[PDB]
Amino acid sequence: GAEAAAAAAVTAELRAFRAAGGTVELEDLPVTPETLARAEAALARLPPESVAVETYTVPAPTPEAFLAALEAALARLAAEGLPAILLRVVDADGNLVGSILVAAAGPPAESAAATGRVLTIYVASSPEGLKVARGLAIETRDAGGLALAIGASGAWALAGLAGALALARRLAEAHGAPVRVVTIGDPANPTDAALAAAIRAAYAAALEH
Amino acid sequence: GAEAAAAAAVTAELRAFRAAGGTVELEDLPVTPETLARAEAALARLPPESVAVETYTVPAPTPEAFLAALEAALARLAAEGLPAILLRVVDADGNLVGSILVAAAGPPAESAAATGRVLTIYVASSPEGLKVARGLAIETRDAGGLALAIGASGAWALAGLAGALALARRLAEAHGAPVRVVTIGDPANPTDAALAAAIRAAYAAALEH
DSSP states (O other): OHHHHHHHHHHHHHHHHHHTTOOEEEEEEEOOHHHHHHHHHHHHHSOGGGSEEEEEEOSSOOHHHHHHHHHHHHHHHHHHTOSEEEEEEEOTTSOEEEEEEEEOSSOHHHHHHHHSOSEEEEEESSHHHHHHHHHHHHHHHHTTOOEEEEEOOHHHHHHHHHHHHHHHHHHHTTSOOOEEEEEEEOTTOHHHHHHHHHHHHHHHHHHOO | OHHHHHHHHHHHHHHHHHHTTOOEEEEEEEOOHHHHHHHHHHHHHSOGGGSEEEEEEOSSOOHHHHHHHHHHHHHHHHHHTOSEEEEEEEOTTSOEEEEEEEEOSSOHHHHHHHHSOSEEEEEESSHHHHHHHHHHHHHHHHTTOOEEEEEOOHHHHHHHHHHHHHHHHHHHTTSOOOEEEEEEEOTTOHHHHHHHHHHHHHHHHHHOO
């Protein structure tokens, strides 16, 4: 099904990042008072309503399409000199299938060199997890790194993660910097738990010899 | 199989902890320079070779047996006034099937009240993940909390986690304090990744309505 195909894309991108010479660091964090407070403090420095929005049409959940959309977002950030951009991702009928907040501290090649990490990819399904993912992406930007926060479910979340890993691989240019992937979940939300389980299973498959 | 039965026990204990009124916070952390340095700093405060060891015989991977072994370890800590104890867990032929480092800051009921967390359960399979799990358990103890670090694989790791969750539930006495479960994995190790995927899948099953 679409979810299985998107998971296979994640597995392939994880394998490809490692084959190019970089470690994938996968973390899973719960929404807790500590993580919510960190996210709020960072969001307050760059208030959500102050961030520019654009809408991209992606009719099917593919890694190639998410990679291209992310490259388009980075190009817009450079052209306008903005710290962040919020992407709404819609299907062929115009219905929203996800969002991506992209936060840059400078040229992506320099952030990778300065911080020792090429990209931090936060992923969440629930609006509660997504608030923390977005805030932690801004926190990473304020520390000098490039970060993005994907809010989506099922095949869309996995295809978005796969495209973000492809972006990390491209930006790393085989210089060996790691990429950090952070799933954020509300502890009670079965959808968030299902997403985390699917990402971990895709990661286990990528490491099998 | 034994692994499936042990995973079902984890799912049942997660469900039971929540039904008793507490949140399970599940975290997954990679071995990185930052986490290794934290673990080393804590291990240096309580050098591994200084910690008492005892060996328990557990012929089959059951939650009931791990719960009882953990209660025995806590009773020994109280009797001897020690900060930690390392358990070697062996099967019926005397072959090691796991280890558990148990670290207490005081009476477990008081640590739950003082820190707002009843127990922190670290789990790892590889010796590399286990070094970090053990060090972070000592770090938690030094912050005032009760912690344990399980080193095991497959059904033994899952049954150990299930017994530790049962211990957390017993110690919490329905007072509502959360339990934190932290899987630690070397980013390249497929066994560590398989363990994390199995724990996440068991967690997703516990949250399904």
